[model samples]
Target: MMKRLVYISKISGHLSLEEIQRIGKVSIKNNQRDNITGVLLYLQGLFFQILEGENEKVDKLYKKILVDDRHTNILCLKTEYDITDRMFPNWAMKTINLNENSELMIQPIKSLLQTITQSHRVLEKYMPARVIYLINQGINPLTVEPQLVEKIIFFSDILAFSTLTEKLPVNEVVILVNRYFSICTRIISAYGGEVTKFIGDCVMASFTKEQGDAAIRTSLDIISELKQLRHHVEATNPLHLLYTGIGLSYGHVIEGNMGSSLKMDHTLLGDAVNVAARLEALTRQLPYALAFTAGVKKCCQAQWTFINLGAHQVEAIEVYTVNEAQKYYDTLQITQLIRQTLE
Candidate 1:
């Protein structure tokens, strides 16, 4: 009988495109030598892997995985022994790179999955395959629920987003929205944050408590990058709508999968989310296009400079918005010092 082991781990640091390719080659070579067959999916700096082989072989490989230095926070999702057959019998290892903006690439993958119609055996035997299938089809797999944890949340929307849809052609509107999402998602993911969802032209992203500082830094990066992106769009495109308003809030959030077997989304919900939304809305009324709640301000006191806006009532709660300044002087100083060292 064969055994299967499934686990997920967070990537320890930034990996370049070449580095990911190298890792993929090494993984395929090692798995083949061990006579293992399964799949690996990488998305948003997280790796979800499945391993299937003989009992002893599976155990041995998993031990090596635990001590691997490239990844951290390993969590085993499932383990099953006495498997009757193999789901991916032909491949030593199959690797899939998951990206939020790759709708065209995902469509062909979804089309391929449609061929496995009405096959309960395939669905039951290949759980990872099913999960990927659902994801490509815009359906979330109700596999594991994230535990409730304290998280820093950020929300934002493109200013005058509605007016763009109302005024622009459908194709042009989509192009603009996709371009905007491309910019936001890259900055958010680069700063170790996960984009929760896109509500029209609005975006909600979450960061772990450990990534609080990164979240603050990411907000500034977005502001800086959007300035350049907005200008480029105005120069090249006829559409004029191109500014963004962002907000930040931090607190305990109910983070997990919320849905049934038919559909599920791993997302965050709580007062923190509501507060962030209100803060984002407040940006329209204030002079600054970016704002954050008092909680986020407190968390980032040492890292950022803020102009406190007096208390405002929203959702029956009083919240404050803090405007960020020109730049993080300390960060600029550190960069110059590093450059001197390199020189």
Candidate 2:
């Protein structure tokens, strides 16, 4: 039987780092006392945890979280939904930043994210197609098993380089881009996102399925932060225009080391990767500030308030037409573009 993919709860309020750590310790200690599985998400000063195990154990943990004094506002974002699988097994305490841009206050959280991102780079050599697909679409790869690939995220430059290149020297542009990639890689990996590869200014990251929920949420959190950064640049440094195109998708992937034996590198290939990249492109065309495929929306803790941006062919894939995709704009609804075959 598959585990459930539930959002769990939203615990928000003024709490010190010590208090948050204490709460984490308490949750883990309690889990130890009761033998529970699952992980937690600390984002925008809120907590979202997926506690799995025996029904009774999970129930007790939820009840305790409700009355915990470390937090004030408590809203259960996700309740009883089937999780595809358990992302984390017997994790006593794991803190991940949903907002990649924010400096993680916890060292453990920082270490965990670094390890995950590095694993992705190692895992992607054989998943090249998976990497290509995400840059073009926001769908999880259909060719790979969910258990192996875990989660895939698409992160693109906030600004258009064509315009930048028009004015700056080639070497200078490369330097600028390298700097940008450095910051982005640090930020994303710091939040448990594995930075797989750099295709132009766009990048791909993967995490285990247990990390999928938080992976997608962290993508959103980063988007919010990126948007703010863009706004700040436009307001303060009009001469320097910086912005980002962001998208996220989750699922299994073909992960391994591949390519010419001498020049091989890890990579991913599959349908989900394709969909995520397409979604990132769609964000630029549609009025919707951000677009999420159905899978992503369903997994998220809450329905993000997004203006429906119509969908369209993502190239080399059979999907709805302009009018069909436009329904997204009309209805603001569309699931991830799932390919029918397991190619």
For each candidate in the order shown, give its overall lDDT on alpha carbons: 0.70, 0.54
lDDT digits (tens) for residues 1-343 of candidate 2? 2232233333445566776677678777877777666677665555556666666666666667668676554433333434555567758657655655455566567567556544544554445543444422323333323334555555465444555666556776776576567666676777676778788777777655555456545555554555455445543232234445566665557775556635755567678887878777765665443455555544545434434344456644321111211212221221111111101
lDDT of 1 by residue, 160-213 (tens): 565556556789888878878888889998988888878888988988777767
Estimated TM-score per prediction? 0.60, 0.44
Residue 292 displacement (Å), model 1: 1.6
Clashes of each: 0, 48
lDDT score, residue 183, model 1? Answer: 83
Off by over 4 Å in 2: 1-148, 227-239, 306-311, 315-343
CA lDDT, candidate 2, residue 176: 59
> Which candidate number has the best TM-score?
1
The ten-residue window of minimal lDDT in model 1 covers 325-334
